Design a protein around this ligand. Sequence first.
Ligand SMILES: Nc1ncnc2c1ncn2[C@@H]1O[C@H](CSCC[C@H](N)C(=O)O)[C@@H](O)[C@H]1O
Ligand SMILES: Nc1ncnc2c1ncn2[C@@H]1O[C@H](CSCC[C@H](N)C(=O)O)[C@@H](O)[C@H]1O
Lengths: 291, 291
Amino acid sequence: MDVVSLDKPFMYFEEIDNELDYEPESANEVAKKLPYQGQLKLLLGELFFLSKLQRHGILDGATVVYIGSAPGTHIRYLRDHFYNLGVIIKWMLIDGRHHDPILNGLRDVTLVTRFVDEEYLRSIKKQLHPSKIILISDVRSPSTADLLSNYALQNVMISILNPVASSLKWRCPFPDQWIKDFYIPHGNKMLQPFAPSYSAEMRLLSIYTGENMRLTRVTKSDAVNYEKKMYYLNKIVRNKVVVNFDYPNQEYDYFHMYFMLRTVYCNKTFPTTKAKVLFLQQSIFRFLNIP
Amino acid sequence: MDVVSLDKPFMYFEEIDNELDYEPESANEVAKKLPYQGQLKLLLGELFFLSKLQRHGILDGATVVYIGSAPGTHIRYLRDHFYNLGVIIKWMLIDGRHHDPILNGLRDVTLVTRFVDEEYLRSIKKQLHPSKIILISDVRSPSTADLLSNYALQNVMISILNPVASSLKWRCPFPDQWIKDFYIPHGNKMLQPFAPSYSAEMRLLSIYTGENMRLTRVTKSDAVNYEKKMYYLNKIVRNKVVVNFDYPNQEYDYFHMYFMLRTVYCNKTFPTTKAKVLFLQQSIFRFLNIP
Ligand SMILES: Nc1ncnc2c1ncn2[C@@H]1O[C@H](CSCC[C@H](N)C(=O)O)[C@@H](O)[C@H]1O
Ligand SMILES: Nc1ncnc2c1ncn2[C@@H]1O[C@H](CSCC[C@H](N)C(=O)O)[C@@H](O)[C@H]1O
């Protein structure tokens, strides 16, 4: 068995302290081990992000504009969680695909069947006015050409919507398929437990102070680094059994999940962080129908 | 006579401490009092900007990419000034219009007859590589639609060229002709002596540290402010005779010119800042054929 003792898990990209040459043979390995693992991946990251905003006092009273939300099954859990905590939030879920019917019938959640373009963003901005906007983007087109186009749309989302905070899908194109250098908003590169086995995707979390917008250039050399750091994390780290982690499941991803979940606010009072987390995890898995 | 005593002049937009309701009748007033005043305006601002870069040690060894350079008569003075100071610089002047023949025959200056588009910027970036680039933009299309398009081109200039510093033409569209909010690079809003009588134009000076690019949103309310602060500066301030300014010319613009020129480096040693400035001004006016 592949055992190890860890203090904490890697929460952000910058923490990854080692790298490995990407082995293309990894692409043929099993990408997922849990049913609805993708909803789980999204749920934890977004619970993590939104709890932070709550902590900074910027969630309550906001309208969460989630673009690329469908099916959005896990979103029903997020909505219930904050709704039950007394946080006042309006959700606007926009995708050209259809949402899970469990999202219907909630006055606080508006489902829109539209593929957004810059012009549409302008109209919803004029229509949301003057509410404070929290943007979450998970739009998906593959090619580096597709990615760049997505990143370009996401930056137009921030410039038109002018949100107070944002969570953006972020996977750097592969160096061997480099097309051109580009800019992404500055933010924390949140790592994702339960991402596919060899995924290099993270979520870019940003909070917007002032009227400034800070971007950061991404070059092919950055792309080489992303590839090697993420390959190391996936191949080595995520394959560790954290034996000094006293928890029903000691696999790295649960250890990593524990650290995100410990930051979540509950109404119920618990005697230990461990009890809260077990509770939140049980709750999350039951909701998603994960054994 | 309209007299006053001033400590220093307003060097940056942010210093303007008062405002006036823009009077549209000002548009019918004499825009210029000196021959070749526009070359003078550009020369001082660019001498000011480039001297700063020299002071920060980032001029020497750079390639100055000046887009919207034609005719560029005053540019010959700038080139000679740094060339004679021993600073090593290559100039690349690009405009679809023709340059003043005084710019020909200098190995350190390349004249290009091309209207730049994003693609061309990409090719000159690949061709300048790996030199450090200093961008100066003075491109001109009028309409707010024209302006926005210019500002959009200028931001693509910075993103593709990825310069170490930049001077950009910057005049905020009028609030009554607002089309949409937009982003300009963050920088110092350098005020311009000898600008037309009621011009609201300034130069955006920026130095790029790290791989980050900071932008700033400009709204209609910002546009209202720009209009009133600049109107106050033009109507009131620029019309003052700074009587406690002991100089052959005490008009505000010469007082303002003095402060930019005092920052310029000369080979000749002078006993007072006043002697250096008189010298630089005499020199500049002789070069431009201004009496
Ligand atoms: N312009 C656009 N506007 C809206 N959604 C878009 C988009 N382009 C692609 N997408 C959407 O991006 C999605 C990526 S899959 C998103 C999964 C979703 N976040 C979840 O919680 O289940 C797809 O549903 C796709 O239709
Ligand atoms: N895409 C573009 N590329 C190059 N120059 C451009 C441009 N669009 C407009 N311009 C140029 O912008 C100029 C504005 S006038 C510039 C004056 C010049 N800076 C001087 O020192 O004399 C015009 O010569 C015009 O042809």
